Amino acid sequence: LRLADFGFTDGINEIIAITENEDGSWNAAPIGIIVEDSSSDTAKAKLYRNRTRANLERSGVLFANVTDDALVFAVSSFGNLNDDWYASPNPPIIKGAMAWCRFEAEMRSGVAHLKLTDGEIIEKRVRAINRGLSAVIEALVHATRYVAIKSDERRKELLERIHYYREIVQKCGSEREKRAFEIIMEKIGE
Amino acid sequence: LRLADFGFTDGINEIIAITENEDGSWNAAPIGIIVEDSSSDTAKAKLYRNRTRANLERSGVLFANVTDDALVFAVSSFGNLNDDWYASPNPPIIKGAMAWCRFEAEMRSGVAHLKLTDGEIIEKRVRAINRGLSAVIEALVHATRYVAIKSDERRKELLERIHYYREIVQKCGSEREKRAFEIIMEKIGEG
Ligand SMILES: Cc1cc2nc3c(=O)[nH]c(=O)nc-3n(C[C@H](O)[C@H](O)[C@H](O)COP(=O)(O)O)c2cc1C
């Protein structure tokens, strides 16, 4: 199998990582899958102390959903998705996803070493470049840092970045990106 | 026709605007097409005094190519594509474009009032979100401004943003985004 056949390129691919909880329910969270060669079946992801890492340590199985849905990224950055977000429970396939794939994973020093074993394209799409989508994704990077730090000066700097990206989403984004951004603002206490 | 059927959403859609020069050749430049209702056939673009605007004043015809190709954006940001970038000379499709559209355009003091009249979906695709692609697009916004202005304080601000986005492209982008960023650095005098 080739990573490129499921929407991955070399570089870092921001996807929704779906992993099985101990009770059999799914956990969904954004992660960046790092790819050196998209013609290959190997990749990796460096994971923080979160449910994704805890599940992969136990199960060694990671599903990925390839999606450009700002809302799914915003919600899953701050909490789990509910069953209502899924079009399919097995394999797990969030509504609106363009593709899914399955990786076997081996954790070493906080890095999930991945081997692609299955997947399918669900829906190819066309969308013009949208800076509002870019802005939601960047804001998520800063907001997730913002909530993890106590420094008032560092937080001030991050909030300025978040406001900068908010102006872009308000000007450029579709209603879906604007909705996603309001989730970010709510979650961080703004 | 409906804008949504050719890849446009409400908001601003960054596309490649292709317009006819005085000599019949094509001019290509990134432009944002502003959409209030993607179910409709109407849109707008706000244009500075550039070749796209001058060409629309003469012809009232705007072709749009919907593409996610970082290299097409970077090259067209700083000049014309010429003739090797096109899969079709008429209607102008750029190689790799996902869709093309044709708009009638009425210029009203820098605002192009657009009506969608023709178009085709060429190729639907799938690509995971990539922050390197985001960063190329942001850097192009700042770099096209940088090269057009003389303010020292403003150029200083813009160069800082460009350097910030460069780091994101190096970390996250594919080789295609990296190649696109190399064009930016060359064009701003940091090659
Ligand atoms: C993503 C992006 C969007 C842009 N949108 C616009 C726009 O909507 N209106 C405008 O006047 N310039 C816009 N620009 C700047 C022009 O593309 C740039 O100045 C170019 O040199 C104009 O070329 P032309 O003289 O061939 O029209 C945009 C640039 C980027 C990279």
Asked whether B34 lines ligand 1 (CB < 6 A), one says no
Q: How far apart are CA A85 and CA B139, in angstroms?
A: 34
User: Is residue A132 within 8 Å of residue A174, measured between CB atoms?
Assistant: yes
Which of B130, B148, B137 shows the shortest CA–CA distance to B184? B137
Type of residue found at B24? G
By alpha-carbon position, which residue is closest to atom 7 of ligand 1?
B31
Best mutation site among B47, B56, B77 for ligand 1 pocket (most ligand atoms within 8 Å of CB): B77
Structure determination technique employed: X-ray
Range B127-157 burial, b when 16+ CB lie within 10 A, else e: bbbbbbbbbbbbbbbbbbebeeeeeeeebee
3 state DSSP class of B126: coil
Contact (Cβ atoms closer than 8 angstroms) between residue B25 and residue B70: no
Domain boundaries, chain B: 1-67+81-126, 68-80+127-189
Second CATH level (architecture) for the domain A1-67+81-126: Roll (2.30)
Burial (Cβ within 10 Å: 0-12, 13-18, ≥19) of residue B161: middle
How many residues make up chain A in this entry? 190
Quick one: which H or E segment has residue B139? helix B131-148
**A10 φ, ψ (degrees, to nearest 5):** -60, 155
Listed in sequence order, the residues at least 6 apart from A100 whose beta carbon sits closer than 8 Å to its beta carbon are A6, A63, A64, A65, A66, A91, A92, A93, A119, A120, A122
- Gyration radius from chain B CA atoms: 16
Distance between CA atoms of residues A126 and B24, nearest Å: 29
> Dihedral sign, CA of A167, A184, B13, B41?
negative
Radius of gyration, alpha carbons of chain A = 17
Residue A172 and residue B12 in contact, taking contact as beta carbons nearer than 8 Å:
yes
**CATH entry, A68-80+127-189, from 1.20.58.290, 3.50.50.60, 1.10.3720.10, 1.20.1250.20:** 1.20.58.290
CB contact under 8 A, A11 and B129: no
B67 is in an annotated binding site: no
- Pairing relation of β-strands B86-89 and B92-94? antiparallel
Q: Would you state the structure tokens that stand for residue B125, as one six-digit string?
A: 């695709």
Same fold, B1-67+81-126 and B68-80+127-189: no
Residue B52 labeled ligand binder = yes
Cα dist. A95→A5, A74, A174 in Å? 20, 15, 18
Minimum-distance CB partner of A126 among B99, B171, B177: B99
Tell me, using a 6 A CB cutoff, whether residue B30 lines ligand 1.
yes
